Write a protein that binds this DNA or RNA. Sequence first.
RNA 1: UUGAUGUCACGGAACCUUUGUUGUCUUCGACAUGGGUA
Length: 1331
Amino acid sequence: MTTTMKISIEFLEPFRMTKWQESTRRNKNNKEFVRGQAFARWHRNKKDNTKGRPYITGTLLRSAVIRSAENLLTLSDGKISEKTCCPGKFDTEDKDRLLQLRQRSTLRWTDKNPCPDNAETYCPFCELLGRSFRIHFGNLSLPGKPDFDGPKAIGSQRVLNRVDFKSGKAHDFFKAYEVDHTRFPRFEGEITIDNKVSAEARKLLCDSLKFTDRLCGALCVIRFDNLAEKTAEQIISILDDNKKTEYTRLLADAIRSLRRSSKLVAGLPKDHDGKDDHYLWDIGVTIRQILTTSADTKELKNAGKWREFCEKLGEALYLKSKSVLKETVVCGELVAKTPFFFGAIDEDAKQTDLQVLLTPDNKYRLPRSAVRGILRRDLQTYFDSPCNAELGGRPCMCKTCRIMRGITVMDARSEYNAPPEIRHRTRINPFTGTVAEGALFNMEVAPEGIVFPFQLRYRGSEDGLPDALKTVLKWWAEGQAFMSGAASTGKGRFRMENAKYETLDLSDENQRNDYLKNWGWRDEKGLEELKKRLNSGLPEPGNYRDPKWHEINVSIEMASPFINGDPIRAAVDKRGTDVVTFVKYKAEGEEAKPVCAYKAESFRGVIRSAVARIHMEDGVPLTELTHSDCECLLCQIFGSEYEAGKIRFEDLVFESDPEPVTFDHVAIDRFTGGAADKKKFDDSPLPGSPARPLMLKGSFWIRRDVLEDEEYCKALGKALADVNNGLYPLGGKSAIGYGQVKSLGIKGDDKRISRLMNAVPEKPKTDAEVRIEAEKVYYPHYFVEPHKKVEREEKPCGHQKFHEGRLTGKIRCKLITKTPLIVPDTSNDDFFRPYHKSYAFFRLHKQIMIPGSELRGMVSSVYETVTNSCFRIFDETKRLSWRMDADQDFLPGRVTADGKHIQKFSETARVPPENDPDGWECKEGYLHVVGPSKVEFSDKKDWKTIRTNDFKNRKRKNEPVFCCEDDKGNYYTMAKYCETFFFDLKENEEYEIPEKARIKYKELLRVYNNNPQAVPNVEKLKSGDLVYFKHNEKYVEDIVPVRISRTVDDRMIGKRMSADLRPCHGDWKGLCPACRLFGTGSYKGRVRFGFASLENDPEWLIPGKNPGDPFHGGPVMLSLLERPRPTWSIPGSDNKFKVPGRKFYVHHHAWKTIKDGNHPTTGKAIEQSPNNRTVEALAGGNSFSFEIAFENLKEWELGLLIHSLQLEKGLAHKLGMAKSMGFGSVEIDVESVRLRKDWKQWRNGNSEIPNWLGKGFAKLKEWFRDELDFIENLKKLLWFPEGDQAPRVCYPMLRKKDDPNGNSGYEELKDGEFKKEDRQKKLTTPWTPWA
RNA sequence: UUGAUGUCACGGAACCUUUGUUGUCUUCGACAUGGGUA
Ligand SMILES: [Zn+2]
Ligand SMILES: [Zn+2]
Ligand SMILES: [Zn+2]
Ligand SMILES: [Zn+2]
């Protein structure tokens, strides 16, 4: 009587439940509840908080039971047992309580007489239906009833959308909660079956329960049985108290990238100087110390919790920065061939805009909804029949919907659990060539090689398997399965492997019984013993159809270095470099292997920009167009915001195993001629040379509609031909000569796109002459004094198109060396020495060659001198300071800065009472703490009268200061002898506090502390005879600790310029021609210099130790190379002393004396020192060749560029090291000039060089009427000495007392011809002697 | 913590849109310090 037996439900897939509702909101018309009727429900224990439990209703289990009962009733020949059944009751009285209505067609098994509601006996269908409260279905709450904090703690929200077949754009979306099946695997319940309706009813209920395949949205088997907040606050407080408050976003991104492993925290790089003073990590305790104490924590010894801690701290830092049925089964494995991206938005992570989909077990998940949608899309593609199936109403009667009704799949998850890698994407402005502001967004992807299981089942009134499904599976097995997102970026191309299939008839009694007992072979052991008997074959479709996407193979050759930027890998690196190469990881099992690649987004951007440049729509460029709601060619090919593109670009990977190389660069000041402070920057590009070219191979997928379109193929061929002919560079820093395209070859187009990819004058004679005398000595540099008028009235043109009336092409050049040339390779400073720095000549891939940055600097300097323009590099962060001589104004004082209205108190006078009865009055005075800076530095080998006690007074009773031995770092700390201390009331007057004398005093202590000359303390203003002040009106001027010492200026160096000679500010004032040609920080340059290669055997100054190899020279020892001293160029504090101009060196042959170990000035000897160089040089008469690529250059601009390269017959250039010793005199010869009339033809241009020179000279005389004296000054400075003419050029010596020649030294030149009031006129005249 | 004559929700791809790019010759000459007379 009412015997009850327990039941269990085990879920094999992640099931879903709907959002919880209150009893007032438990209605019929609510859309979310009527949608979630198919899923489980949630229950709240108490309404104050979210504590509750889930449960499943009994009506859903009832519906599954009658569905299975109908299936076995229509499968067992319509009849059951030995008595006639019924079709079933179908009647509803009240329409105001219908929660759900049956909109599905009832399966018809017979047209016999239905049994009535009241008869002698009841059929099994009647008692299962309920026509006989007899059968009760219980609830499925939980096994043992564990309590839970909330719904969010047991599952996760997810959003699913609906797409359109024609456009590919989603138009609607909904969301649902999903929980993991491994967290809640098991649900118990009770059921009351029958009392007196015999055994066939319970048997029918038994195989109806056994036939129940799915429930609650998933396939199931029914059986009858810390410190993150504290660390973030500490880091925030330390960054706030210390300086460098910026770069917090980069630090947070670096910390997020650090979550991969715990061992990288001990491998952070240091500063460029080698000390542990990194700008991003050694700021302070240090940030590195904080992360080190966080690393060696017993709590954070594991991996997943360390990852979660790093994610929380990174999020905190980002928030701070703000015969009938025939069941057919198919199984296989989906393998990734590209990195994929399944979208899943989480509100808890606001740092990355797009987030990949993961399980709470940190494993990658492939949902079944995407598989079902892609199957529907491929079916609609094969049949070419869009369907208008609405969400509700009558079921749709299309062929695709009938094929889909019967398709079941199985969710998959992998074993790879490493965190994803972040990818950044940036826009580029077309009118400028730089990245536009506010275009930063990151997004991560799963790596390639992740393998998923795959299962599929079919149930339909058909003998075998549909031909459309067979064709779709053949397409997937070919390797054209595109299911995940970002397809235009080239993401998510899977290939199905190990296809197995078998059909099972569902009308034979034995096979049906095998189905019921074996439970459909849907469990794990069921799959395990089904796979062995599963057939390994695969059928072939009859009406086969070709796929809609075609693969095109691309090969690119690069005879140049290449780099793709990555700031995050630069921040978390092993070495100190500003820029590194982009590197991506691929997964195989659990390990991830890194490879250098070229980003598909970069290639897509380059190709899109090329097509937009070469195609014009009614005069308006495609770059300038908004590309919104327009039918242009670029939107039709590459897609837009409202449609998907018909072309997909894949990632490109390099061949062989290249290794990165290190190149170092520095900026050169225009005036001083030395390297500007804090301007040394490094670079780590991939190596490339014409001898060993780089092979960039890859592919891209194109649609058949574009392939059959003749005009689209023609435009693509035009763009690919323009890319092939060296016009569009790939990568970054192309101005140095990086990433030039030599050759480009495509395959797989059937010769339909690739078929479109198929006398010099002489230099003018010079006219400037220089008189050279055979007994005079000249200064080894001069200034040109450029003109005070510059042009900024020209508006630059953009890079968005090729403007008419301008020239684009290449220039081949030559270079011959007249003096020895030194181009150093600074990677290794210990070549010759087995410490003294050594250096070596530059060599890329074991080939002697010259980088393009040095040549760019030479041509930029000469072009900047010829065309009047700003100083492109100037150290405006320096203040001058000169020493005054003995000569009345600086009155002594002893006062702080508190207030006003003071008197003439305190005592100060010279002392070394017993001499006079009234004198040496000592009442006020305490222990003195003073700055020890009152002894000379005569050298020529403790403070409080211990180490020194001698005087000079011996015979003449005068001058008692004795010449002491200052060579042990002594007698500066030991000071204050004959102190001007006290004993006369004649000092200490008024003082007020300015904002100018104070910073001048701290800069005076900066000069005193950082003195690199007298080293063989205090940074505050204190008393102790340190208030020697002069005053004007009420305020005061600068103060000094010693009555005769160094004084500092108050005018900065940048105010020594002209009104318009200051560097260009931009941010629109206008641009100078040099900034207009070579570019600024917010403007791309229009020239591209290339690397210069050698032709023949290099001749060296000294042969090497091994005569077999002619590629190695011999060492030569250079002399002392010390810093420039602007204090001689600008003599004093006067307003009339300004800057002379830009510095140029002179041509001479002093290296002949330097070869045989002689100084240029003394001629005695050269000794080993820790402060010189021992390099090797290329001899005179060496040929180099290079190429300059230009775009949209004007005629006069090209003429002046040609003039700046060629010069005249008698001039030369300066290159390399030791320009003061006459090293590196080169001349540039123009060999060939090519132009670009059209994309298909490239013409001559060896002619029209005199025409361009004439237009350039016309522009020069347009700018300046007759004041072209700097041109003759340039020609005089660049004039090369002729034969039988060897002038002597050397720097003056420190003193005359050691000169065999007897020439005047610096101290004699100070009073004489190089007087203070005429030094700026005697230095601004080329070849002016001083001897 | 479902209520007994009617549940195709395995009826719905988080899909499409965006070059980490621009600018810089691994270069080179004049000093450092305070007294000492009337
Ligand atoms: Zn019946
Ligand atoms: Zn349809
Ligand atoms: Zn458009
Ligand atoms: Zn400028």
